[PDB]
Write a protein that binds this ligand. Sequence first.
Ligand SMILES: O=c1ccn([C@H]2C[C@H](O)[C@@H](COP(=O)(O)O)O2)c(=O)[nH]1
Ligand SMILES: O=c1ccn([C@H]2C[C@H](O)[C@@H](COP(=O)(O)O)O2)c(=O)[nH]1
Lengths: 316, 316
Amino acid sequence: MLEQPYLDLAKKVLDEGHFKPDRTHTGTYSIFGHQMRFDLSKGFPLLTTKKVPFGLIKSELLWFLHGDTNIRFLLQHRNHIWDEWAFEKWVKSDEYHGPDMTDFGHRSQKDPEFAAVYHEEMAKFDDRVLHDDAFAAKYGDLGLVYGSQWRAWHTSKGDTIDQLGDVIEQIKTHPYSRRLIVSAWNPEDVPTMALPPCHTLYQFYVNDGKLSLQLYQRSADIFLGVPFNIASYALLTHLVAHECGLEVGEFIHTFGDAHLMVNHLDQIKEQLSRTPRPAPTLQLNPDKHDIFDFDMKDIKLLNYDPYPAIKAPVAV
Amino acid sequence: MLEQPYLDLAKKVLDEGHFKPDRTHTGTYSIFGHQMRFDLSKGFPLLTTKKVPFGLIKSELLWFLHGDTNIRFLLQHRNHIWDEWAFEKWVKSDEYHGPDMTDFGHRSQKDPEFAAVYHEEMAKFDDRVLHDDAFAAKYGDLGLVYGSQWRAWHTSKGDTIDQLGDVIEQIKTHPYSRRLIVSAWNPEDVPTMALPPCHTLYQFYVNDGKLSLQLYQRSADIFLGVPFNIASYALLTHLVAHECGLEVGEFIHTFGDAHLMVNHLDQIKEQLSRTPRPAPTLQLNPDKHDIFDFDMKDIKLLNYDPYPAIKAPVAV
Ligand SMILES: O=c1ccn([C@H]2C[C@H](O)[C@@H](COP(=O)(O)O)O2)c(=O)[nH]1
Ligand SMILES: O=c1ccn([C@H]2C[C@H](O)[C@@H](COP(=O)(O)O)O2)c(=O)[nH]1
């Protein structure tokens, strides 16, 4: 089907990746340099062989698109993808008084006890950010996150560039530009960052009135990360194609070090048992075009029929 | 052979690229998103099916590696790859008095006459830069060129980062880092630049004591540019692998818009007639390691036996 390349990417790593140790010394099977294409005219690449939550995908993209960097928008949509990065700062801080939460990363993984004190202090932090304004400002803003890299890149001369809004301008005016690139990799910030971006950059390409997109993704978790990353970019590709009035062409996904966590082998094997079903369809508010002022309701998924979801332990 | 992927890349564009207009309205056959691998343990990818000048390749890389941005080093090695970018500034300038050289780009292409006045004022500019110091400083420095992007990226806080020297440090100390990336794409400079970089970025990968390298090349001239670009990166890959004491693994070459100029069809077809010969061998001064203080003599090419070179008109 249309997910096939995702599945070939996973088989390829199973019976061809060498063992590579990683940071959280879980170890991993890894290959380097891979590239898939999805033809977005054939359907939208949300995996059917397993249940991916579109809603989390949507809220995060829109959050990136509004150029927002503050957790609060997400929590408002019940999207917690980014909580630990914000909460970490709370924890490592003066105004913080409480159960030390040092490397709660692991220590909530080996300890049902601790993991109820954490999955609990979190519960409040999140609530605080929702309710206390000045709190959200201090703790819920993340600073350097896709939203601000795409929409407000800091110049050395103190101003801010809206790369993404600029490139779309150019797409309407010089469709054939070979220079239609958005980068999230800042070399001054990149040493002092908790997670220098995974999605290093992307490039638009237009021809025969179709828009394409290729993503350079430095590092991929095949099981957990990639099924999400594919949907965001594909969505992005559509929104842009909508705003510039083009048709959608392809989304190309290039990887650097694409890997499987060594303890995801069972799960990913189970998945390879399943047989893809036809892909869902994407659908856009034909009235609204300014994609920056786009809302949950303006974007919607048709005919999504996935296999059950698959629990996998997450790497700490 | 080892060049095959280069040749498959060219066939692919011939009987599969659609026509895409470009900037210099020569037009072009283009595809978007492609990826080749060369296994550098099998030989060095300098095309044999056509005569590429290694020497120009070497001088330019070393120039990049010394972090130099001044034409003078190159001219000293009889390497003119970068002259028109420097001379252009001479021409568009106060201290310049002479035959207007407005878009000498084209106007030296349709005019044997003019093309002897230009290929002539050039002759002096170059000489001036070689001999007059203060001249070289004013006109022969290029500013933003790989050398300075790799080795002296300007921070917003006024300092300069040596990305490349930093990443090598990291390769010795955290071989498994998935973050070993050098970027040449600065979004503040990129709007105001004559030629925002083609070689947008690269990423190193280490495993089983082998070094690999993948290059994201936003835009490629298949006939003229790519046979050179491949050798630089492959060389780079070796020098780094030398300095960090690793073996060489692969060079992966990912493209965005890879294209053929519409008037290069004959030439590239002629070339596809030829049959690759075995690849040359690279060889490094086993005594010197600091690759920054590496010189022409320290690097050398064995067993290169190419077919004749192929004249092609250059796109203006
Ligand atoms: O959108 C994302 C965000 C993160 N990761 C995964 C990939 C790696 O396993 C890890 C990044 O860790 P480092 O690459 O920085 O070491 O997170 C993804 O796959 N997709
Ligand atoms: O190392 C290089 C430098 C330049 N080019 C070619 C590719 C394009 O045809 C052109 C870049 O033009 P724009 O992509 O900026 O429009 O130069 C290369 O292929 N390799």
